[PDB]
mmCIF file of C-alpha atoms and ligand atoms in Angstrom:
data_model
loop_
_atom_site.group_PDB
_atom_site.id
_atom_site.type_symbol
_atom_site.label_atom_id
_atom_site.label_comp_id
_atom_site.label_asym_id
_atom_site.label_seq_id
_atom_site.Cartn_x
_atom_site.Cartn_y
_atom_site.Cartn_z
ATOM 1 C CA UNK G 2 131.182 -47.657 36.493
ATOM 2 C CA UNK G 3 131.185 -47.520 40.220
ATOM 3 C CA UNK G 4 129.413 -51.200 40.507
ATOM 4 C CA UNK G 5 133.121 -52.743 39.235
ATOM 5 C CA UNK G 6 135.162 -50.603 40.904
ATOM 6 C CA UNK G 7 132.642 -51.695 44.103
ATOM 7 C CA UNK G 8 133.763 -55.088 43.328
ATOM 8 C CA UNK G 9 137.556 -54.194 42.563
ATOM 9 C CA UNK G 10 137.879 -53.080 46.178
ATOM 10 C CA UNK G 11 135.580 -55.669 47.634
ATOM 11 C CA UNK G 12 138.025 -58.573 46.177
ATOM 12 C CA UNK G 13 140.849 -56.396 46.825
ATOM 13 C CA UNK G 14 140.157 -55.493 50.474
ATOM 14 C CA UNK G 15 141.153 -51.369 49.807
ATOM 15 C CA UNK G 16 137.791 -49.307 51.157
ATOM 16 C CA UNK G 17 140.374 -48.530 54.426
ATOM 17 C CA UNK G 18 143.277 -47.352 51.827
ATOM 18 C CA UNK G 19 140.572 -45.587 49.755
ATOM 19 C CA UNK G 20 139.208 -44.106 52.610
ATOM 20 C CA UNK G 21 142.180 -42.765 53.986
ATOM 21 C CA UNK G 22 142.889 -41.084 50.658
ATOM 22 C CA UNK G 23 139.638 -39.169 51.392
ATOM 23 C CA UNK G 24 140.461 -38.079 54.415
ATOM 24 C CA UNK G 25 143.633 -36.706 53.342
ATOM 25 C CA UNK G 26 142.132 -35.103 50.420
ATOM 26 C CA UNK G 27 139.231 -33.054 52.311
ATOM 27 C CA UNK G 28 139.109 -29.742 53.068
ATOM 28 C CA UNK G 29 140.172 -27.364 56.209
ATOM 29 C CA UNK G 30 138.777 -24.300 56.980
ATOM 30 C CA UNK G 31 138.229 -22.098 60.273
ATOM 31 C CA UNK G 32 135.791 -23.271 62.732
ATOM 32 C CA UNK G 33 136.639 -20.258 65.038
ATOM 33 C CA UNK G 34 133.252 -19.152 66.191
ATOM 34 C CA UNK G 35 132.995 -22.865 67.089
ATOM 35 C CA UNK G 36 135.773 -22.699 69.292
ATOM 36 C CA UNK G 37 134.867 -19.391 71.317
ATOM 37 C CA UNK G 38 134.967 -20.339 75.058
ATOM 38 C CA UNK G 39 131.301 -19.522 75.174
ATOM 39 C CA UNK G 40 130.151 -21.574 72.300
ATOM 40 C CA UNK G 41 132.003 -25.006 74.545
ATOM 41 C CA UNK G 42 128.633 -26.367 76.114
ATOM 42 C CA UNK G 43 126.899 -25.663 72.613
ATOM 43 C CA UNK G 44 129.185 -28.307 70.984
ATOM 44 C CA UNK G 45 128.232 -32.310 71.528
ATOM 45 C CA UNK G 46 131.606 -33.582 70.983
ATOM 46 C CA UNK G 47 134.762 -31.244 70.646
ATOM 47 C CA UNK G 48 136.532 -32.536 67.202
ATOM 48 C CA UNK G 49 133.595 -31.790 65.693
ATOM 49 C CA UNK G 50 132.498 -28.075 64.360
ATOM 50 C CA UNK G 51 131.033 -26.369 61.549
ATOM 51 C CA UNK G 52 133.433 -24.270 59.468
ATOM 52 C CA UNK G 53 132.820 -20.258 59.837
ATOM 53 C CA UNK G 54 131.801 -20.635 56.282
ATOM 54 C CA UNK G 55 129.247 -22.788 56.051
ATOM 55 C CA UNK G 56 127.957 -22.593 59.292
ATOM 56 C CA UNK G 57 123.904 -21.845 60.277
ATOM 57 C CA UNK G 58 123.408 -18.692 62.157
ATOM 58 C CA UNK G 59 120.801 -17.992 64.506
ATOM 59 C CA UNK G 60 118.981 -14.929 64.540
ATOM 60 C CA UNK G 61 119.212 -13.819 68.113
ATOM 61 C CA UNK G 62 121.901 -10.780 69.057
ATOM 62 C CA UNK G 63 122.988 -12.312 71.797
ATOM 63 C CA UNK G 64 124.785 -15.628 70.578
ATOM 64 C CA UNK G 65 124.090 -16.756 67.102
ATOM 65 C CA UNK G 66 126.210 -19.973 67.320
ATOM 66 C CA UNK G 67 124.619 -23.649 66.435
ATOM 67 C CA UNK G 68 126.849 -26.288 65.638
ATOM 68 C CA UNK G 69 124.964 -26.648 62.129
ATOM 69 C CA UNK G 70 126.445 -27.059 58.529
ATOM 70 C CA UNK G 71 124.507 -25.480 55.217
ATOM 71 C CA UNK G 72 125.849 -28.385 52.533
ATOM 72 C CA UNK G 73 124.670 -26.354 49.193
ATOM 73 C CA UNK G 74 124.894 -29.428 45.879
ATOM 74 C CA UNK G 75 125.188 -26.725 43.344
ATOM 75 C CA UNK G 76 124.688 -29.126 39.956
ATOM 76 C CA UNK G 77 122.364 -31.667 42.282
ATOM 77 C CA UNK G 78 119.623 -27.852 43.264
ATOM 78 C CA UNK G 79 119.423 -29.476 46.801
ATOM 79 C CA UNK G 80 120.397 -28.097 50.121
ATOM 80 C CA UNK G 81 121.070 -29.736 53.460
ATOM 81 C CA UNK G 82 121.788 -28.449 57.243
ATOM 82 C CA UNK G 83 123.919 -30.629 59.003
ATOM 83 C CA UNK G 84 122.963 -30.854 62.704
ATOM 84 C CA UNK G 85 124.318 -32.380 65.943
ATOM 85 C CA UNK G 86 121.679 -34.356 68.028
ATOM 86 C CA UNK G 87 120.284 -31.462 70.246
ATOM 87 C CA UNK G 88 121.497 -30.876 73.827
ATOM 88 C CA UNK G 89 119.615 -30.207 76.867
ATOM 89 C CA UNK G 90 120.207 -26.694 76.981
ATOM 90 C CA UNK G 91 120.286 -26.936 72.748
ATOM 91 C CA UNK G 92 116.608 -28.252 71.830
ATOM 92 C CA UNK G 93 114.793 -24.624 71.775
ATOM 93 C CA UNK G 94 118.143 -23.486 69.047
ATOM 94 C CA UNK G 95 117.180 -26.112 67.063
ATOM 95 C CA UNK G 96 113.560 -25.482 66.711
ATOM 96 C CA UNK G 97 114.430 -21.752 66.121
ATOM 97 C CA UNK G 98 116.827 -23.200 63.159
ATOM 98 C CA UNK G 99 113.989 -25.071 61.906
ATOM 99 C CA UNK G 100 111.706 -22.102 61.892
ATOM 100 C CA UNK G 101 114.342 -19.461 60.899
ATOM 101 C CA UNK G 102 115.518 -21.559 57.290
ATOM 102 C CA UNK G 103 111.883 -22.855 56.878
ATOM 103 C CA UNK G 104 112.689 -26.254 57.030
ATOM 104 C CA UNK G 105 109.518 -28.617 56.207
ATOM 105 C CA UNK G 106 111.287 -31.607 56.988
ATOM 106 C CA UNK G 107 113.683 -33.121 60.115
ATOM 107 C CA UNK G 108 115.187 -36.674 59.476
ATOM 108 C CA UNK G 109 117.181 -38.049 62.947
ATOM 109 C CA UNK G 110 119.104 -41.090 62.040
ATOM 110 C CA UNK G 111 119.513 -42.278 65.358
ATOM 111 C CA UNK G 112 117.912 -43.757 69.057
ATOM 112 C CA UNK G 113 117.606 -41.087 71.582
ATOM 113 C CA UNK G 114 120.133 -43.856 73.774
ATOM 114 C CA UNK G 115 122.530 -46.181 71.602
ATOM 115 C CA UNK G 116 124.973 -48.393 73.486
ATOM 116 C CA UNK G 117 123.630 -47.421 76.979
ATOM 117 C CA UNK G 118 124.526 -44.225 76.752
ATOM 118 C CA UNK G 119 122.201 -40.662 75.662
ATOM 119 C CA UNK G 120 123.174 -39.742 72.069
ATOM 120 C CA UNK G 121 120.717 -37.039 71.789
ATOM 121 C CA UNK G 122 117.675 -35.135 73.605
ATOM 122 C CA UNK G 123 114.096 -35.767 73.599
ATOM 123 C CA UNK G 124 113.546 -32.849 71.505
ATOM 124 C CA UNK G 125 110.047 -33.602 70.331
ATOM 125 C CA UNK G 126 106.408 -34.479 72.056
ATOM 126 C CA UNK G 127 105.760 -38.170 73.340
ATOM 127 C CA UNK G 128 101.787 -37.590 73.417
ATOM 128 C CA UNK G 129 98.982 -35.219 71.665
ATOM 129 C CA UNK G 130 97.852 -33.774 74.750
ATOM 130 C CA UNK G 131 101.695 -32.752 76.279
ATOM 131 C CA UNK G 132 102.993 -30.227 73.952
ATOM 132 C CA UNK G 133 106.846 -28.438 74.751
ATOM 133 C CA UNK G 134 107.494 -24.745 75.377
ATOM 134 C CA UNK G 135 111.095 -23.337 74.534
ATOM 135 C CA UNK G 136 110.601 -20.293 76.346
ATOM 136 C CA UNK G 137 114.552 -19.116 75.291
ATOM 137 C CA UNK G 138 112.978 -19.184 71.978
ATOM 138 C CA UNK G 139 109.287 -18.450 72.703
ATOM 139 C CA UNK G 140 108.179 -21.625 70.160
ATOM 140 C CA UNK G 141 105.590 -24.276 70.744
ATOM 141 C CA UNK G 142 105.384 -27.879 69.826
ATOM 142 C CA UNK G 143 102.538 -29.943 69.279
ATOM 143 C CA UNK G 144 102.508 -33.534 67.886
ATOM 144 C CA UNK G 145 99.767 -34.307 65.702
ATOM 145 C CA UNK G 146 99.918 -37.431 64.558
ATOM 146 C CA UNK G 147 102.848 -40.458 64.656
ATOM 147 C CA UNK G 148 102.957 -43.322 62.185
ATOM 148 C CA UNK G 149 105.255 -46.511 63.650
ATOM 149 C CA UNK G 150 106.318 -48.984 60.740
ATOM 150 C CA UNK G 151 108.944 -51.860 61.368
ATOM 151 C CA UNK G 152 112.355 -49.589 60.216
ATOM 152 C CA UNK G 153 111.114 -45.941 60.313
ATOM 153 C CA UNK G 154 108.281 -43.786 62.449
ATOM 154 C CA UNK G 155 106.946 -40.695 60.406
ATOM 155 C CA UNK G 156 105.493 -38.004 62.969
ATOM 156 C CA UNK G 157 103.673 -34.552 61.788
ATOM 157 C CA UNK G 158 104.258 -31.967 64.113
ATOM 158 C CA UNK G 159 103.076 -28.531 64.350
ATOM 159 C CA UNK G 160 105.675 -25.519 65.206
ATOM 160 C CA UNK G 161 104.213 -21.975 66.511
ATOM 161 C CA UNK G 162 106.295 -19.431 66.830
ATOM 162 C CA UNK G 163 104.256 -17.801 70.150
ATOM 163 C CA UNK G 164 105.638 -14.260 69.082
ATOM 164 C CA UNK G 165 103.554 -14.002 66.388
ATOM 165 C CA UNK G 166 101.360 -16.931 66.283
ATOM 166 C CA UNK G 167 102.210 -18.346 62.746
ATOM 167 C CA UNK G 168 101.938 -22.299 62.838
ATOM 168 C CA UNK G 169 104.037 -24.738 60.688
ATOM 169 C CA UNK G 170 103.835 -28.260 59.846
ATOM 170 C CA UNK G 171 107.255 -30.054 60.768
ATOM 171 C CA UNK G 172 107.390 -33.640 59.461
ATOM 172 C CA UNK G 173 109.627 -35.750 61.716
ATOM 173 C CA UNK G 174 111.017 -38.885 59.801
ATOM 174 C CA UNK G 175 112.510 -40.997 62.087
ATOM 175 C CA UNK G 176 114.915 -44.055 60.893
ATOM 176 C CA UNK G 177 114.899 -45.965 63.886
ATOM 177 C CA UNK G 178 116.752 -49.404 63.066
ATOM 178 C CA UNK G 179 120.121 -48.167 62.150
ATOM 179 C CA UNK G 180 122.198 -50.716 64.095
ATOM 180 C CA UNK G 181 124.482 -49.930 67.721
ATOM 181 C CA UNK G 182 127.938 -51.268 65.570
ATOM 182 C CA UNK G 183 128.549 -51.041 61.750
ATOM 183 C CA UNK G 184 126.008 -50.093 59.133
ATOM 184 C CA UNK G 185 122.541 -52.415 57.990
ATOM 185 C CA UNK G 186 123.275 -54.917 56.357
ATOM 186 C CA UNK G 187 121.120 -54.040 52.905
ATOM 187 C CA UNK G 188 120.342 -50.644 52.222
ATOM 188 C CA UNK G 189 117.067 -51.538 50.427
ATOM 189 C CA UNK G 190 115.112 -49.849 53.918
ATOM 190 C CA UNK G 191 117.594 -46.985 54.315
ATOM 191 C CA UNK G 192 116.603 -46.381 50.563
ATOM 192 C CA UNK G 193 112.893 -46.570 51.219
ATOM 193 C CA UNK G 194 113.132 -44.469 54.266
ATOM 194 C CA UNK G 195 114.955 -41.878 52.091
ATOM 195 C CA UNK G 196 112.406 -42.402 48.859
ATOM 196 C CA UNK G 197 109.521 -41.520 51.356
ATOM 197 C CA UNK G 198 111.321 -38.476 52.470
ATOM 198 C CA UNK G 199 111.735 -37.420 48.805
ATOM 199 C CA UNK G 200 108.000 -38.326 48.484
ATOM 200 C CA UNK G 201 106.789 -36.119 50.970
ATOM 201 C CA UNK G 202 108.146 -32.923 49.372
ATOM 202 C CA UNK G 203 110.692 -32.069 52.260
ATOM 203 C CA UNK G 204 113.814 -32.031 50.067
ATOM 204 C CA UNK G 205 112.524 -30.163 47.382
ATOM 205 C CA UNK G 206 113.084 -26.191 46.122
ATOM 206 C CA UNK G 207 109.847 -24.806 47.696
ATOM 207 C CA UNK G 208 110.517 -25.144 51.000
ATOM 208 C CA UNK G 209 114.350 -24.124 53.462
ATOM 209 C CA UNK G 210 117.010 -27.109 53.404
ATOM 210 C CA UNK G 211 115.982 -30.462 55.281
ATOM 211 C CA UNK G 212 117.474 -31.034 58.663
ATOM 212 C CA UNK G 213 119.474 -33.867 58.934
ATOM 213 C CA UNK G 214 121.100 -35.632 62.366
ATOM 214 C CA UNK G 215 122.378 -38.551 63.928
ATOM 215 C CA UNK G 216 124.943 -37.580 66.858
ATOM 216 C CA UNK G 217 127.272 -35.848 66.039
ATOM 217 C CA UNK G 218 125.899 -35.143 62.054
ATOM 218 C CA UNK G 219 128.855 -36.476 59.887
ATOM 219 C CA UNK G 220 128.524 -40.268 59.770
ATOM 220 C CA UNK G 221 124.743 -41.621 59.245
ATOM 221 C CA UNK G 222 124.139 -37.706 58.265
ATOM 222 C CA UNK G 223 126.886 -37.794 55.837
ATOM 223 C CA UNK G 224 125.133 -41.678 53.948
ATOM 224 C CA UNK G 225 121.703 -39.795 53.608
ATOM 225 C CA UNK G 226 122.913 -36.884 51.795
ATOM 226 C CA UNK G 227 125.902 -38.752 49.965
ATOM 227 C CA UNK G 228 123.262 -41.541 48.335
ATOM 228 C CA UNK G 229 120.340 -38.957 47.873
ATOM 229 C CA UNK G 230 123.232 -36.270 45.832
ATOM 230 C CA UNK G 231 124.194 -39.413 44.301
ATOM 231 C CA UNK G 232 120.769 -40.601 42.613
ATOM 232 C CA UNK G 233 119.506 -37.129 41.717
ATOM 233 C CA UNK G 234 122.653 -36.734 39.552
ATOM 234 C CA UNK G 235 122.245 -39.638 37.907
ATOM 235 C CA UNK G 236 118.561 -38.806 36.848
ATOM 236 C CA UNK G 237 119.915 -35.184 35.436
ATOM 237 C CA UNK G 238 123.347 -36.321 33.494
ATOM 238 C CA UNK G 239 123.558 -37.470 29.548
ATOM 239 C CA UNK G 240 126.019 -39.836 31.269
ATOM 240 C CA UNK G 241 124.857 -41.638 34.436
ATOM 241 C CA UNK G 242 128.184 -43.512 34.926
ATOM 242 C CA UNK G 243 129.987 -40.070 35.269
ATOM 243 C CA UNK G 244 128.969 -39.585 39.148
ATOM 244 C CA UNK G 245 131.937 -40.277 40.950
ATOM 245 C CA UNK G 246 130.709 -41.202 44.622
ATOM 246 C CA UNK G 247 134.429 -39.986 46.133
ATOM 247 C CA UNK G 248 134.114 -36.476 43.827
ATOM 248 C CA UNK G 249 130.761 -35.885 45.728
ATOM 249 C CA UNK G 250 131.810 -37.258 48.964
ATOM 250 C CA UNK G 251 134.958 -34.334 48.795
ATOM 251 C CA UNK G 252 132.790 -31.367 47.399
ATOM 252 C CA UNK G 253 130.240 -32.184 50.290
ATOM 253 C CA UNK G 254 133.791 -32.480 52.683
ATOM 254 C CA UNK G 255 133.859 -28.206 51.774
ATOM 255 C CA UNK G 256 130.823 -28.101 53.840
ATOM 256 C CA UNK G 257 131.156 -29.653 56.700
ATOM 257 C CA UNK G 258 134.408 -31.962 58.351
ATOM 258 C CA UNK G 259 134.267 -36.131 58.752
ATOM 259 C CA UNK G 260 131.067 -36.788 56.351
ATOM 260 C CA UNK G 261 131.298 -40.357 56.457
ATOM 261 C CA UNK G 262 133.425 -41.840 59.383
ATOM 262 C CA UNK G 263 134.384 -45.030 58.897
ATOM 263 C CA UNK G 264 135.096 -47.628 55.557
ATOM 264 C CA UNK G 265 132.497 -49.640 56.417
ATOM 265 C CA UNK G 266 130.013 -46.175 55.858
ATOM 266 C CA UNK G 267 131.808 -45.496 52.918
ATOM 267 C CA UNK G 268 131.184 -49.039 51.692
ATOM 268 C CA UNK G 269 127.453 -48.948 52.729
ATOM 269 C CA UNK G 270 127.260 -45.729 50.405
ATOM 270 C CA UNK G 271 128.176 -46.678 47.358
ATOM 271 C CA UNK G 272 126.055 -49.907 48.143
ATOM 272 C CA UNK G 273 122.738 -47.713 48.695
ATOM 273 C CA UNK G 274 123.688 -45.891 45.470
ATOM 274 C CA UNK G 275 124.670 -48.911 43.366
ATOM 275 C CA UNK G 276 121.049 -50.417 44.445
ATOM 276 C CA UNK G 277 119.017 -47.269 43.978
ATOM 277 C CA UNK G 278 120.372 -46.653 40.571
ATOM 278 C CA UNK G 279 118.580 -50.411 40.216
ATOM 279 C CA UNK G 280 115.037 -48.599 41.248
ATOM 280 C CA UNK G 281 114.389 -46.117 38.937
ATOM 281 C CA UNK G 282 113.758 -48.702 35.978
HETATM 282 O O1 JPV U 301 127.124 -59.224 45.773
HETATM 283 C C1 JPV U 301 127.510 -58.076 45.019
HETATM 284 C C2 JPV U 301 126.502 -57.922 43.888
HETATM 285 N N1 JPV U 301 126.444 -56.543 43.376
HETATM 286 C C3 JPV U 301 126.297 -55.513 44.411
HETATM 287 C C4 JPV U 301 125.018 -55.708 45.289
HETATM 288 C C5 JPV U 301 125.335 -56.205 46.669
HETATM 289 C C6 JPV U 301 126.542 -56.750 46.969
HETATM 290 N N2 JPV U 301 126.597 -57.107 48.298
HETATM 291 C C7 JPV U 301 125.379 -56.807 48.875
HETATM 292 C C8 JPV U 301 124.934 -56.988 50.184
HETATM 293 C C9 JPV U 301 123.649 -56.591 50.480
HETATM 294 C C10 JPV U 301 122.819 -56.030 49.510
HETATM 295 C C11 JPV U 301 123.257 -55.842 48.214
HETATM 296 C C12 JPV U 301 124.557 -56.237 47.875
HETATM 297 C C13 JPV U 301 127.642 -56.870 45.963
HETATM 298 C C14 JPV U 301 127.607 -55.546 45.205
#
């Protein structure tokens, strides 16, 4: 059971040792596309790139690149893409990403500027009344409605694709307390943030994979999909204590590099896991 093996390297001080096994463990694969000279100002941050694999194409002849991970959780039935914040020259990709996998839900797990410094575009509306154009991808957005609570801001957004004039709604959830250094202290609002994004129907078989991002989409992304892969095994298996969190951690690793990027993430993981287990009831 993960809870004493939690404690066993608590006491012990290992999670850097046993994280370091992880990272020697995880998978390589070709990110060539990622690489192409032309792709460079597509890319947030160099040492990180999708894998030719698994990565999310657009549909535009042109250039089809994103930097954008499909994480399929074969036993788990749920999907994820893995996103970078948006760029400047990125945001109008990223809605036709959204609208291309039919995506119902977006979840950004980080401030637009941490530690003085942009970490991502202003990618969606501020007001009702001023809407964005991405005229490289001829798509409109509207937002329709915000809702501001103390860790988290839920916004509905509508998506048109001004080609054809189909509209979506986009729900935007928002965790907006993650803080600057380490990881929150107690998961028990990273797990209620991520029980009302289950709740609203985003992560489920109907609809295209969720987008998930923070900066670079491997650290904070990497928790959210770790803990939620996590807890839905548990509900399906004879034997909840089977779920190793490291197994899960490596199988999502095939998907996309550096899922998880520190110890004290890793720690914070099995944490939310141990205490959502604790929920159900
Ligand atoms: O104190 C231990 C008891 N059992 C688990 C729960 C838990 C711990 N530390 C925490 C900090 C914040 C929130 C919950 C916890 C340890 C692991």
């Amino acid at each position: 059971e993960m809870e004493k093996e939690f404690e066993q390297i608590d006491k012990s001080g290992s999670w850097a040792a046993i994280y370091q096994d992880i990272r020697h463990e995880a998978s390589d694969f070709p990110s060539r596309v990622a690489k192409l000279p032309k792709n460079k100002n597509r890319n947030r941050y160099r040492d990180v790139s999708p894998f030719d694999h698994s990565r999310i194409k657009l549909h535009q002849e042109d250039n089809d690149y994103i930097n954008a991970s499909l994480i399929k959780m074969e036993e788990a039935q749920r999907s994820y893409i893995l996103t970078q914040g948006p760029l400047p020259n990125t945001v109008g990709h990223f809605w036709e990403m959204v609208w291309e996998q039919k995506s119902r839900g977006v979840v950004m797990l980080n401030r637009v500027m941490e530690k003085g410094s942009l970490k991502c575009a202003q990618y969606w509306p501020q007001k009702e009344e001023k809407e964005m154009i991405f005229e490289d991808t001829n798509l409109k957005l509207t937002l329709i409605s915000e809702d501001i609570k103390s860790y988290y801001t839920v916004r509905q957004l509508e998506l048109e694709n001004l080609t054809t004039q189909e509209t979506r709604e986009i729900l935007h959830f928002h965790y907006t307390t993650w803080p600057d250094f380490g990881v929150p202290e107690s998961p028990a609002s990273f797990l209620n943030f991520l029980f009302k994004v289950r709740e609203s129907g985003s992560l489920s078989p109907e609809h295209g994979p969720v987008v998930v991002h923070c900066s670079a989409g491997i650290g904070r992304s990497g928790t959210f999909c770790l803990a939620d892969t996590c807890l839905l095994l548990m509900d399906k298996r004879k034997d909840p204590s089977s779920v190793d969190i490291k197994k899960v951690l490596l199988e999502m690793r095939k998907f996309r590099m550096g899922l998880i990027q520190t110890a004290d993430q890793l720690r914070f993981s099995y944490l939310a896991v141990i205490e959502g287990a604790k929920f159900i009831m």
